[PDB]
């Protein structure tokens, strides 16, 4: 599941970049950047197999300049890209939002998918569907936008819900996160809403968790945080990359108690995930 | 108003009061970057397309509604110079498909502005498009309704709007009524009368009896030219010398024009000729408020300025000449 990530000079990809994967299927792979200018595009020049290969394209558009001609430009890519290969999904960003109002924001959003819409209409193609996110460097909507655009390249999305939603049944858990040791991208959750503020507490959690770990090396990842309140954060590291980060509230019992059976029936979650080959 | 909104509004008495109205303006101003799929053609295409959609958005009956090829749209027809000399050109022999006493420049139909079923009621507006069209003639498409919601005509307005600037062109909007009855609408809108510094009829630099047979208004319409300006009426009795063969009349109505009017290819003043030679000039507010000031106060500089007026009038007199 190898993402393409395509937009013009100076939209911020090799930022988006930089921020997310240096701070295969599931792990974050390097993906493959391609500046895009406006020109003639040449009718197959060997860029079958490219996209062929491409699990899902993302495209990237600069909300500060003028995006008509970047719309018209991402209709001619889609015009092929749909022809080629019927199955890939299609990602649009809306980058560089952090300077304006909601209002703005939800009208420029609307604006470019009825721009997208009518485009697609004009060229003939039919049954395509492509998301649109408001993303930004700055906040957590670039790390959420890539958490859908890798969550929609797993098929056993349904099956890491029910076990999560089950271990989260079993243990007290508020709300348990399983995500991944590089670029903080969550793949799987429960059917509980994914809160903004909980999300940044697990990831600046992670980023504690590895830079404590870097500070003290040269002699399996574990960490219990628990605050004031009696509400416990906790740490295990899954199979290859993937970390499971989960909210436990006490609910006025023990707190040695409540982390033996959490980390028992995170150890049984474990050797569940053991069986199925999520990892990598 | 209870006769016509019951569905008994064939009738067809002049009616002294009128519904809700807006006419839209067609102005060519740009061409896009790529899009190439020639500048003078590439706005016939939208032109087409434009009234592609219009009659594809056609109000249909629930019988029609589930049935499953829709009839060709009617042609617009082009030409060159002021339109009377079309209507006199039609009097060639050969075919019946050009231009049909009286004749209707426009055709009228019942569209479906709401499509998707967002609202609980029925919407149906009713539009007008011109049979005519030239490149230095704006184009009217006009929009007549009584009791639908003013927020599904405005996006129907603004994907006709996108659909115009994937080609070139671009769709203005300007008052329904005449320039010169605003002052006695709207007290608070802009209005301004020109009387230009040089007068052409009277001037012994500038003066023919023959050129005043040919166009007596050839130094305004140049000096309207060159300001950027498009002719808004088309029809009318101010500009062009020849006959007709009866009276025309347009789709929606007797066209009850004093003067010529005039549109900026910007789409932000409106200009109006006069028949002693003075010029009325006002601001599009409408287009300001959906979408500045100097320009209308540097055409008012060159009508009351005597040199550059002078140059422009020398201009016209040097095209004239050679
Ligand atoms: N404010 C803001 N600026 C951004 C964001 N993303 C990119 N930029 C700007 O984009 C510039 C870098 O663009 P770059 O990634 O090199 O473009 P690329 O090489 O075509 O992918 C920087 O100067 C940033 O200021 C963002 O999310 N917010």
């Keep these: 599941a190898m993402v393409l990530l395509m937009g013009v000079r100076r939209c911020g990809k090799s930022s988006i970049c930089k921020v997310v994967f240096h701070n295969s299927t599931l792990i974050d792979l390097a993906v493959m950047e391609l500046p895009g200018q406006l020109n003639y595009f040449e009718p197959s020049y060997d860029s079958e197999r490219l996209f062929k290969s491409v699990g899902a394209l993302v495209y990237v558009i600069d909300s500060q300049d003028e995006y008509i001609n970047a719309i018209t430009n991402l209709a001619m890519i889609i015009e092929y890209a749909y022809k080629v290969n019927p199955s890939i999904n299609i990602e649009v960003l809306i980058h560089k939002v952090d300077g304006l109002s909601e209002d703005f924001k939800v009208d420029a959003q609307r604006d470019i998918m009825q721009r997208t819409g009518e485009e697609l209409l004009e060229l003939g193609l039919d049954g395509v569907q492509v998301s649109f996110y408001l993303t930004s460097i700055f906040d957590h909507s670039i790390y959420e936008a890539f958490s859908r655009i890798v969550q929609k390249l797993i098929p056993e999305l349904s099956f890491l819900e029910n076990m999560l939603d089950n271990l989260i049944q079993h243990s007290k858990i508020e709300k348990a996160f399983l995500f991944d040791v590089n670029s903080k991208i969550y793949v799987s959750t429960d059917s509980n809403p994914v809160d903004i503020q909980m999300y940044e507490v697990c990831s600046e959690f992670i980023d504690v968790t590895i830079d404590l770990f870097d500070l003290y090396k040269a002699p399996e990842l574990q960490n219990v945080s628990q605050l004031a309140n009696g509400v416990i954060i906790y740490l295990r590291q899954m199979i290859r990359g993937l970390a499971l980060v989960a909210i436990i509230r006490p609910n006025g019992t023990d707190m040695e108690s409540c982390l033996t059976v959490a980390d028992y029936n995170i150890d049984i979650f474990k050797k569940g995930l053991e069986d199925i080959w999520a990892n990598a | ?322």
């Design chain 2, 1 to 322: 108003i209870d006769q016509v909104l019951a569905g008994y509004g064939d009738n067809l008495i002049d009616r002294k009061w009128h519904g809700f109205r807006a006419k839209y303006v067609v102005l060519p101003t740009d061409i896009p970057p790529n899009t190439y799929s020639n500048p003078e053609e590439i706005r016939v295409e939208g032109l087409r397309r434009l009234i592609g959609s219009i009659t594809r958005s056609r109000l249909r009956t629930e019988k029609e509604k589930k049935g499953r090829r829709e009839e060709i749209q009617p042609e617009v027809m082009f030409y060159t110079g002021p339109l009377y000399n079309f209507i006199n050109e039609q009097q060639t022999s050969l075919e019946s498909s050009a231009i049909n006493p009286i004749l209707m420049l426009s055709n009228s139909l019942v569209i479906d502005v709401d499509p998707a079923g967002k609202s609980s009621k029925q919407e149906s507006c009713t539009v007008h498009y011109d049979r005519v069209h030239n490149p230095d003639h704006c184009f009217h498409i006009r929009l007549e309704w009584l009791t639908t919601t003013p927020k599904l005509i405005d996006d129907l307005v603004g994907n006709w709007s996108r659909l115009c600037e994937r080609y070139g062109l671009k769709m203005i909007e300007i008052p329904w009524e005449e320039l010169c009855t605003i002052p006695s609408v709207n007290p608070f809108h802009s209005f301004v009368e020109i009387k230009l510094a040089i007068n052409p009829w009277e001037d012994p630099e500038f003066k023919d009896r023959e050129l005043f047979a040919k166009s007596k208004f050839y130094y305004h319409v140049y000096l309207l030219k060159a300001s950027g300006f498009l002719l808004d009426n088309r029809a009318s009795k101010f500009l062009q010398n020849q006959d007709i063969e009866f009276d025309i009349m347009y789709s929606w109505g007797k066209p009850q024009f004093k003067y010529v009017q005039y549109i900026h290819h910007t789409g932000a003043y409106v200009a109006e000729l006069r028949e002693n030679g003075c010029l009325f000039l006002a601001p599009n507010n409408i287009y300001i408020s959906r979408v500045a000031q100097k320009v209308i106060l540097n055409f008012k500089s060159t009508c009351l300025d005597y040199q550059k007026l002078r140059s422009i009038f020398l201009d016209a007199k040097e095209m004239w000449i050679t």
